[PDB]
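Severity: low
Component: inverse-folding endpoint
Summary: output formatting inconsistent between runs
Steps to reproduce: submit the following structure tokens with default settings.
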């Protein structure tokens, strides 16, 4: 029988809304906060020469200079880790991550940020299967642009198994970057962490887990764009 009531507030309370404003244009999406880090979408840095507007339940912090942000890239994935400034209020460290086991049930979890209140928001349940190496994974939970970086949570155990990343062009197939192996290890042992700063993607497309990814919808597997 489908699993009973599950509490997702612990997971959503850690969700942040990010907005990068460099050289004119701006990219904004979500990220999962963990300890001194925010886990988000490597494609947040389509440009990296401005300000980062973080928006947690603690309020709104702003990073005056993106280029100073210590960042650790996840190879072959549209994922990345950000070490927030030293004068930044940490996030707890209870979230549990793990790789997505074939055919399991997952739900997209968010938070309401238009204020008037703060709030969990859980989507409908959906099956999920890989796509090539296991980089991106397929799910059919409606997702809208700007919603990348949102956690996909295992209805089974409650772990986060990946962050929503891209969508095909008609918007009828959705893909999320999976958690990588030994990811948890990577979050506590400040050794496997390979920091750099000022990194950016300075291409308007890139190849990941088998598909071509455009930082935006235009005018092997199917094309996709990052949401």
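Observed output (run 2 of 3):
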């Amino acid at each position: 029988l489908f699993k009973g009531p599950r509490d997702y507030n612990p997971i959503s309370s850690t969700i942040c809304h990010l907005t990068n404003e460099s050289d004119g244009h701006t990219t904004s999406l979500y990220g999962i906060g963990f300890g001194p880090f925010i886990i988000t979408n490597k494609h947040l840095f389509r440009r990296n020469n401005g300000t980062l507007l973080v928006q947690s339940l603690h309020g709104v912090f702003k990073v005056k200079n993106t280029t100073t942000l210590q960042q650790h890239l996840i190879d072959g994935r549209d994922m990345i880790i950000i070490r927030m400034p030293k004068d930044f209020p940490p996030f707890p460290q209870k979230l549990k991550f793990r790789e997505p086991q074939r055919e399991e049930r997952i739900c997209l979890v968010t938070t309401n940020f238009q204020t008037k209140s703060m709030s969990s928001m859980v989507s409908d349940t959906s099956c999920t299967f890989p796509s090539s190496d296991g980089i991106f994974w397929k799910h059919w939970i409606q997702t809208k642009d700007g919603q990348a970086g949102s956690p996909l949570v295992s209805t089974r155990d409650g772990f986060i198994v990946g962050i929503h990343s891209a969508s095909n062009f008609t918007n009828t197939n959705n893909y999320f970057t999976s958690v990588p192996k030994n990811f948890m290890e990577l979050l506590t042992n400040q050794e496997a962490q390979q920091w750099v700063s000022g990194w950016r993607l300075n291409a308007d497309s890139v190849l990941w887990g088998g598909h071509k990814v455009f930082m935006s919808k235009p005018e092997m597997n199917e094309l996709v764009y990052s949401q």
